């Protein structure tokens, strides 16, 4: 029996979904952590069967989703919840959506898990470039995209057996500048990539639990289209499909199959690493021309 | 005529001072940006001449300090100032200490400058390790150590001629784990190192202004002794003096002479880089033994 | 139906063997390339049952070796053969052991293959440090341990299917200094790591074929002991198990399981990468003790 | 009194020359090591006044060349000399041009020196891409462009003072793929960059002598044009000036000024480093256009 918690899916157009599909391929139970703004919509869609096509793991297996849970990676515990999110329309009718709470919720419903996925970033000010990003926007980008992993680790590490495994998603802009990726997103991925190392040391010696981060190529996810710098993402994708060593469409499932391997024991000797899953685009210095 | 603003000195035991001394060696006017907690003490010391020994640039030149100014890299503009720091004993009798303000203050007293130094980090929760650092502590570590550079850049970039140059100080723990360097300091240096690149792109195309970061070896500065993990720093220093390729005491002046070169036109083709000034300690994988 | 050529074994004590064991787990035919001086000696042990214990893939299946072949990574083609190797005791009673020769021999007997492994190294002068390494020795290290890969790719790419996969092993001594790892091995590994990118481009664009390199941690293999610099290798294992993030004992299979992954469609989105499989040692800066 | 040996010029059109100009600015005697095939041709141009314009260090001082010497980076010692180079038109009327020979010749004429420059490269087969590069060509690239450095250090370290400094040039093609940079040059550069660390250790521990490598941007030198792959080099300069963070035209002096710094006491705390001097191109991922 194998259980994974995937933090950060709102649709089937993301990497979370890709990750979810490949794990199913290996008969691992999938628990979804949905941000509360998009949650009710997501159940509504699910119940109505908009995702039935998308849940097809070819080989006559249906994607096996254990549970779908509200989740906000900005709140550690209940007292971190402010009194405006206490009132908010989307959050009013929901409980147990903080990191501490969903950790407890999952543990009490199903026991210890052994796989953890951090598939969420958020940066209020992504459209304004680094130079023109306010303190508030930066720190918020860091809270939501970087710290959330750390906090996920602190809390979930109590509901994980040894030999467990954690992944997050990052982007190459932390190592090399990509204009357009603003609002501190690059700073945040840079921080995330560094924390992945540090945490690997603590989680390793103390828990025999591994943690790595996947550096993805571009994918036309909802969030990617919202970078809205025909856009940053459509450009990111044409460049990639034309200048990558591997000239094939990069799919959400391509990240999953890698995420899957890392989450398994097969990667028992890899920890602290940023693994590029991106058709090799990062190795290139100049366009062929 | 050459002017540098050095943000973050409280004493002569830091890298700021080292940087200050070497710049003098090249007849560049030095403006000090002092954190207001330690400011009055610092003038008190200065007036009393505790730094007279320390201001000796051997070659019968006295260190040339243009001006000493209160400065808090946590506040961008005046309205960012909270009403407790409005009241505070240390800050009560002081004005113009925000980034926007000291930028204006310097500009109006002396005109455009051409050199900028970011020699400050701060992380409330440095003693607690990454895993056990609260959101508040992390974000605060990022605000004070990483964002401050960005904000320094936004504001000072109006009071700098083209061909100007900016440096910050970082530490190798952003790339490789150093247990003890907690509270998000590593995350912060990681972010700082990434922002140094991004900013180099914006500051370059738009202003013809360069920015680089120096990755220092350890030095027994006041702040280093406060990491207080016979301590993290005394250990960091013994290891270095015994396992570095260069087996010589690393001095504050050693960082300065490099900081000096970067701030000069001599480094007109270097930008976005992390430069290791650390007796080569970073190149080593294993102790000799 | 899946075939893997592993070039670079002489026994069960190395990484090629672990790599081999883990491929059997997926029912992929293995063809072994053995350095001629030790091939007859290897067949002897094979015939005499010495590897039978080592050949068990736990779950009631014998390791399915398809063929074992004499293979020398220093000669590319027939005419690359010098005339004391026409004479040498060991090579005499052997034929078709050059790279183009074993590519054709394999191709002729079994047709198209789809998984390549470079698992060989040699630096004649490894015991002398880099400064005291002669032209002859340096260059022979690079011919044997770096150029052999390119050669393999050049000749094997003819006998491979699209979507095929290649790996090579490497050691972190290329990126950080390991005193004792002399003879130009470090140099060799560095050229390998870089060649892996470059090859990725040509092999990826032109053949839709991927290539990566596994950077392993220390393993008491025959050649690791032959380093002989207790031993260089006793130190490296000792340190790694005191200091690596993961307390556990590293196994050729740990690396094997990873190689198996890189060699499958499950990683179609990864190429040009150095993947570290070293229980995370590479992420550490200083020890804690 | 300061002496620098620059090995690897044939004209005023290269980096050795810019390096040379910038050293004169500090009144350091320069000794030139010229590849024998082009030395007589070089002295001719020298005698005939062709370099006189190029020799002005603006401020009313002629470039002070101490000596120009025949120097071949492929032979270490007298007996390393093959017997068609006993015969060759070009080498015939020349003596003492091996590395140990010119180390002794210099030592004998001028005593101890303290600044070394490796500024030479050759990959016979640069135009063929890595996959199509022969053993002969690969290895000759590595002998000429990587092992020559170590050789220099081995033989020159005898004729140097403590605290002396060494540099070599290198190109980012070792770390990221530049299609067109074939023949094993990239391989060669990679081994150089790594050898620089390793050497740093031995040279630093044993001799208190530093060594670093400058990674430059494209420069239309004689050999850059000889790449001949418009030209590979026209493309690289064109791109660099559209895309590098810094709009300006890169000059051998830009690199020269940096080399001068690395070669002085002003950097006593830097060794084993690759310093990028490329107007910041290396930090970019994608272009904006
Ligand atoms: N799409 C790409 O091209 C690409 C490339 C590189 C990296 N990434 C990374 O992949 C990860 C997933 O992004 P994506 O592109 O798949 O799109 P996405 O829309 O799946 O990304 C955000 C998802 O996480 C959820 N989320 C946001 N804030 C949250 C919070 N506070 N708590 C809980 N959930 C929250 C959103 O509802 C959304 O479903 C991110 O880390 C992103 O940085 C994406
Ligand atoms: N000392 C070392 O061994 C070492 C090693 C690597 C990097 N560094 C870096 O060097 C830089 C300087 O640190 P240091 O070790 O020289 O000690 P330091 O005591 O000089 O560092 C902090 C200085 O900046 C000031 N400061 C702190 N917060 C401020 C704020 N909000 N606004 C204005 N000033 C503020 C303090 O008064 C103090 O003078 C830091 O960036 C640190 O990360 C130090
Ligand atoms: N064991 C470790 O601690 C370790 C760590 C990092 C990397 N590596 C790398 O792993 C790879 C596997 O080596 P290993 O350590 O398992 O030792 P090993 O003795 O199992 O295998 C190395 C093999 O290379 C072979 N070889 C040398 N020249 C050859 C030639 N011309 N043709 C064919 N074969 C040739 C040797 O015969 C030997 O069988 C090597 O590339 C090594 O550099 C090993
Ligand atoms: N120009 C660029 O665009 C550029 C960019 C990055 C790096 N580099 C590097 O800068 C260094 C300087 O080269 P350059 O580009 O100025 O070209 P250059 O023609 O000025 O100098 C290269 C020199 O190497 C010499 N050389 C080759 N084999 C030799 C030998 N055996 N002994 C002595 N000298 C020998 C050639 O004769 C030539 O004079 C080279 O290492 C090159 O790889 C150049
Ligand atoms: C307001 N902006 C956002 O919330 C945002 C922006 C980008 C996001 O992820 C990425 C999407 C595409 C890419 Cl190329 C990299 C990414 O990190 C994500 Cl996950 C969120
Ligand atoms: C509460 N802690 C701090 O305020 C603190 C801690 C460390 C600081 O700088 C360093 C001091 C020593 C080193 Cl080794 C690296 C550093 O970044 C600095 Cl500048 C401040
Ligand atoms: C004469 N020396 C050798 O032949 C030698 C030395 C080391 C070899 O592989 C390694 C063994 C151990 C390690 Cl740590 C790294 C390695 O690359 C190999 Cl495969 C061979
Ligand atoms: C046959 N080819 C050559 O001899 C050659 C090719 C390139 C050389 O230097 C460079 C010239 C340009 C660039 Cl971009 C990088 C370089 O390393 C050099 Cl110095 C020589």
mmCIF file of N, CA, C and O in Angstrom, chain A residues 252-284:
data_model
loop_
_atom_site.group_PDB
_atom_site.id
_atom_site.type_symbol
_atom_site.label_atom_id
_atom_site.label_comp_id
_atom_site.label_asym_id
_atom_site.label_seq_id
_atom_site.Cartn_x
_atom_site.Cartn_y
_atom_site.Cartn_z
ATOM 1 N N UNK A 252 3.084 16.825 -19.266
ATOM 2 C CA UNK A 252 2.961 16.779 -17.809
ATOM 3 C C UNK A 252 3.365 15.397 -17.322
ATOM 4 O O UNK A 252 4.135 15.260 -16.353
ATOM 5 N N UNK A 253 2.898 14.377 -18.038
ATOM 6 C CA UNK A 253 3.313 12.993 -17.763
ATOM 7 C C UNK A 253 4.849 12.761 -17.763
ATOM 8 O O UNK A 253 5.328 11.882 -17.056
ATOM 9 N N UNK A 254 5.611 13.550 -18.522
ATOM 10 C CA UNK A 254 7.078 13.420 -18.514
ATOM 11 C C UNK A 254 7.684 13.822 -17.168
ATOM 12 O O UNK A 254 8.649 13.236 -16.717
ATOM 13 N N UNK A 255 7.100 14.812 -16.516
ATOM 14 C CA UNK A 255 7.533 15.170 -15.177
ATOM 15 C C UNK A 255 7.104 14.095 -14.184
ATOM 16 O O UNK A 255 7.891 13.695 -13.313
ATOM 17 N N UNK A 256 5.874 13.611 -14.334
ATOM 18 C CA UNK A 256 5.348 12.596 -13.437
ATOM 19 C C UNK A 256 6.253 11.382 -13.337
ATOM 20 O O UNK A 256 6.683 11.004 -12.236
ATOM 21 N N UNK A 257 6.567 10.792 -14.492
ATOM 22 C CA UNK A 257 7.369 9.549 -14.565
ATOM 23 C C UNK A 257 8.712 9.691 -13.860
ATOM 24 O O UNK A 257 9.252 8.729 -13.321
ATOM 25 N N UNK A 258 9.246 10.905 -13.880
ATOM 26 C CA UNK A 258 10.452 11.200 -13.134
ATOM 27 C C UNK A 258 10.097 11.373 -11.651
ATOM 28 O O UNK A 258 10.785 10.824 -10.781
ATOM 29 N N UNK A 259 9.018 12.116 -11.373
ATOM 30 C CA UNK A 259 8.600 12.385 -9.994
ATOM 31 C C UNK A 259 8.325 11.069 -9.317
ATOM 32 O O UNK A 259 8.717 10.850 -8.174
ATOM 33 N N UNK A 260 7.677 10.181 -10.060
ATOM 34 C CA UNK A 260 7.394 8.822 -9.631
ATOM 35 C C UNK A 260 8.661 8.077 -9.169
ATOM 36 O O UNK A 260 8.686 7.489 -8.086
ATOM 37 N N UNK A 261 9.707 8.111 -9.992
ATOM 38 C CA UNK A 261 10.968 7.399 -9.714
ATOM 39 C C UNK A 261 11.623 7.901 -8.425
ATOM 40 O O UNK A 261 12.042 7.117 -7.561
ATOM 41 N N UNK A 262 11.693 9.220 -8.308
ATOM 42 C CA UNK A 262 12.203 9.849 -7.107
ATOM 43 C C UNK A 262 11.392 9.466 -5.875
ATOM 44 O O UNK A 262 11.951 9.155 -4.826
ATOM 45 N N UNK A 263 10.076 9.457 -6.008
ATOM 46 C CA UNK A 263 9.244 9.092 -4.870
ATOM 47 C C UNK A 263 9.398 7.620 -4.464
ATOM 48 O O UNK A 263 9.111 7.243 -3.323
ATOM 49 N N UNK A 264 9.870 6.799 -5.399
ATOM 50 C CA UNK A 264 10.078 5.384 -5.142
ATOM 51 C C UNK A 264 11.431 5.151 -4.474
ATOM 52 O O UNK A 264 12.256 6.062 -4.384
ATOM 53 N N UNK A 265 11.637 3.918 -4.023
ATOM 54 C CA UNK A 265 12.899 3.440 -3.442
ATOM 55 C C UNK A 265 14.012 3.357 -4.488
ATOM 56 O O UNK A 265 15.189 3.367 -4.130
ATOM 57 N N UNK A 266 13.644 3.284 -5.772
ATOM 58 C CA UNK A 266 14.620 3.206 -6.879
ATOM 59 C C UNK A 266 15.647 4.345 -6.870
ATOM 60 O O UNK A 266 16.752 4.215 -7.416
ATOM 61 N N UNK A 267 15.264 5.460 -6.260
ATOM 62 C CA UNK A 267 16.131 6.620 -6.145
ATOM 63 C C UNK A 267 16.677 6.758 -4.726
ATOM 64 O O UNK A 267 17.006 7.865 -4.294
ATOM 65 N N UNK A 268 16.792 5.632 -4.017
ATOM 66 C CA UNK A 268 17.204 5.611 -2.600
ATOM 67 C C UNK A 268 18.552 6.278 -2.290
ATOM 68 O O UNK A 268 18.834 6.573 -1.123
ATOM 69 N N UNK A 269 19.366 6.528 -3.314
ATOM 70 C CA UNK A 269 20.680 7.122 -3.111
ATOM 71 C C UNK A 269 20.826 8.565 -3.629
ATOM 72 O O UNK A 269 21.917 9.160 -3.543
ATOM 73 N N UNK A 270 19.725 9.121 -4.142
ATOM 74 C CA UNK A 270 19.646 10.521 -4.613
ATOM 75 C C UNK A 270 18.874 11.382 -3.607
ATOM 76 O O UNK A 270 17.733 11.068 -3.260
ATOM 77 N N UNK A 271 19.481 12.480 -3.164
ATOM 78 C CA UNK A 271 18.841 13.392 -2.201
ATOM 79 C C UNK A 271 19.549 14.758 -2.228
ATOM 80 O O UNK A 271 20.766 14.813 -2.352
ATOM 81 N N UNK A 272 18.785 15.853 -2.149
ATOM 82 C CA UNK A 272 19.352 17.216 -2.166
ATOM 83 C C UNK A 272 19.515 17.816 -3.551
ATOM 84 O O UNK A 272 19.971 18.948 -3.713
ATOM 85 N N UNK A 273 19.107 17.056 -4.556
ATOM 86 C CA UNK A 273 19.400 17.389 -5.927
ATOM 87 C C UNK A 273 18.281 18.157 -6.584
ATOM 88 O O UNK A 273 17.102 17.972 -6.251
ATOM 89 N N UNK A 274 18.692 19.030 -7.500
ATOM 90 C CA UNK A 274 17.848 19.597 -8.520
ATOM 91 C C UNK A 274 18.030 18.762 -9.797
ATOM 92 O O UNK A 274 19.108 18.752 -10.400
ATOM 93 N N UNK A 275 16.975 18.071 -10.209
ATOM 94 C CA UNK A 275 16.998 17.220 -11.408
ATOM 95 C C UNK A 275 16.278 17.861 -12.582
ATOM 96 O O UNK A 275 15.057 18.064 -12.533
ATOM 97 N N UNK A 276 17.018 18.147 -13.646
ATOM 98 C CA UNK A 276 16.419 18.793 -14.798
ATOM 99 C C UNK A 276 15.623 17.813 -15.636
ATOM 100 O O UNK A 276 16.173 16.892 -16.240
ATOM 101 N N UNK A 277 14.309 18.016 -15.636
ATOM 102 C CA UNK A 277 13.407 17.316 -16.533
ATOM 103 C C UNK A 277 12.865 18.362 -17.495
ATOM 104 O O UNK A 277 11.869 19.042 -17.208
ATOM 105 N N UNK A 278 13.522 18.487 -18.645
ATOM 106 C CA UNK A 278 13.295 19.627 -19.515
ATOM 107 C C UNK A 278 13.836 19.429 -20.925
ATOM 108 O O UNK A 278 14.222 20.407 -21.578
ATOM 109 N N UNK A 279 13.901 18.178 -21.384
ATOM 110 C CA UNK A 279 14.418 17.852 -22.729
ATOM 111 C C UNK A 279 15.837 18.394 -22.974
ATOM 112 O O UNK A 279 16.239 18.668 -24.116
ATOM 113 N N UNK A 280 16.582 18.572 -21.886
ATOM 114 C CA UNK A 280 17.964 19.045 -21.947
ATOM 115 C C UNK A 280 18.188 20.516 -22.269
ATOM 116 O O UNK A 280 19.325 20.924 -22.465
ATOM 117 N N UNK A 281 17.127 21.322 -22.303
ATOM 118 C CA UNK A 281 17.253 22.739 -22.652
ATOM 119 C C UNK A 281 18.302 23.510 -21.848
ATOM 120 O O UNK A 281 18.878 24.473 -22.347
ATOM 121 N N UNK A 282 18.551 23.091 -20.612
ATOM 122 C CA UNK A 282 19.495 23.807 -19.742
ATOM 123 C C UNK A 282 20.976 23.699 -20.113
ATOM 124 O O UNK A 282 21.780 24.535 -19.701
ATOM 125 N N UNK A 283 21.327 22.685 -20.896
ATOM 126 C CA UNK A 283 22.717 22.424 -21.264
ATOM 127 C C UNK A 283 23.202 23.359 -22.379
ATOM 128 O O UNK A 283 24.412 23.538 -22.568
ATOM 129 N N UNK A 284 22.259 23.971 -23.094
ATOM 130 C CA UNK A 284 22.570 24.806 -24.260
ATOM 131 C C UNK A 284 23.048 26.192 -23.874
ATOM 132 O O UNK A 284 22.532 26.773 -22.915
#
